[PDB]
Amino acid sequence: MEQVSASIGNFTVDLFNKLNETNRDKNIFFSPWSISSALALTYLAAKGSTAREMAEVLHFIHSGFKELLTAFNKPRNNYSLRSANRIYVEKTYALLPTYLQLSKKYYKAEPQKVNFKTAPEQSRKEINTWVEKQTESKIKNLLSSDDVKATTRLILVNAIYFKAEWEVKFQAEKTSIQPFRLKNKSKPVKMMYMRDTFPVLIMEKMNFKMIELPYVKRELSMFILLPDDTGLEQLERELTYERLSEWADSKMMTETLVDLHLPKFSLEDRIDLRDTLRNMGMTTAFTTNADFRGMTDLAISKVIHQSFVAVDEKGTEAAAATAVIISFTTSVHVLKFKVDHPFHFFIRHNKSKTILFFGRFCCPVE
């Protein structure tokens, strides 16, 4: 379990940087966990050189997913981590059982053979529906008429739902419309607020403070690396999975009374990873000369991923009802932790340190 989590950990920072390079000016967001996991599948069918490269990319033993997969989906109640990763091939291609035995074994998921050959526009609907069913109906039409063709061969789709009430919800009566500073730009945002205790990590060394806003029973938590004063460029350079792990896990990050200002925000992203992965070192799995002989005797033609998040006075897409609210403002110093400028933020399964979501917020720009 502690070997895979590092893999993701790295794959994450990398995937991030890449995505960044293109959009040095966008809000980056994705589920590193929902991608390695989904890419693991094909991988568990990628032999020879197609693998040697995939391994390099995802940073690669195999039970690390079964072990984490249940951990999360099994109960680890108090947060819902519904995900949908599958492999759709044409009715024509041939599946070599061992693969089925294994996918079913670790990934409680079976590759579905579909008819792309003469029911492209239909197969699609079928897919976009499975997604819809597996995500609690929050992810609509994942694939577009342009994403499914008769030329299509292997489509790996990977989405993921996610609900979690914060541990200690904010009071809406306190959310005021403040300005999210971007020295020349600035726009407004419903800025949540509360005074409480959170593990914080300060350090003038790299000029940035870190806070851990824990979800229920602190199973999963959100971490916000906020640069003392996009202003993020320097902090993202120093960014490593090493430094992140030494930090969040650091015995130097401790509970502190804090006046918290957290922009009630929201991000959703869809990513056609083909170009991205090709560029990161995964190339051969897309040529017709793919060594996917692990499952058949064909190449990935697409990979559509799609995650989202919506921080609010409850955490994320939460079924709420905070019936009884009874705060006791009582009396008498504070670490003002105002999150009113570009920041980094990720969500983790603290137990296992697996980063599930990761992102950068810096643009309310509509």
Swiss-Prot record:
Q: Outcome of mutating residue 74 to Q, per the record?
A: Reduced interaction with DNA
Q: Which GO terms describe its biological process?
A: chromatin organization; chromosome condensation; nucleate erythrocyte maturation
Alphabetical GO CC annotations of the entry are: chromatin; extracellular space; nucleoplasm
> What does the UniProt record report as the effect of altering residue 181 to A in this chain?
Reduced interaction with DNA
- Annotated region (Required for oligomerization and DNA condensation) at 314-330
Q: What job does the chain carry out?
A: DNA-binding protein that promotes DNA condensation into transcriptionally inactive heterochromatin in terminally differentiated avian blood cells. Promotes tight packing of nucleosomes into spherical clusters by binding to linker DNA and subsequent oligomerization. Acts as a cysteine protease inhibitor towards CTSL (cathepsin L1) and CTSV (cathepsin L2), but does not inhibit serine proteases.
State what protein this is by name.
Answer: Heterochromatin-associated protein MENT
Species of the source? Gallus gallus
User: Lineage, please?
Assistant: Eukaryota, Metazoa, Chordata, Craniata, Vertebrata
Question: Which gene is this protein's source?
Answer: SERPINB10
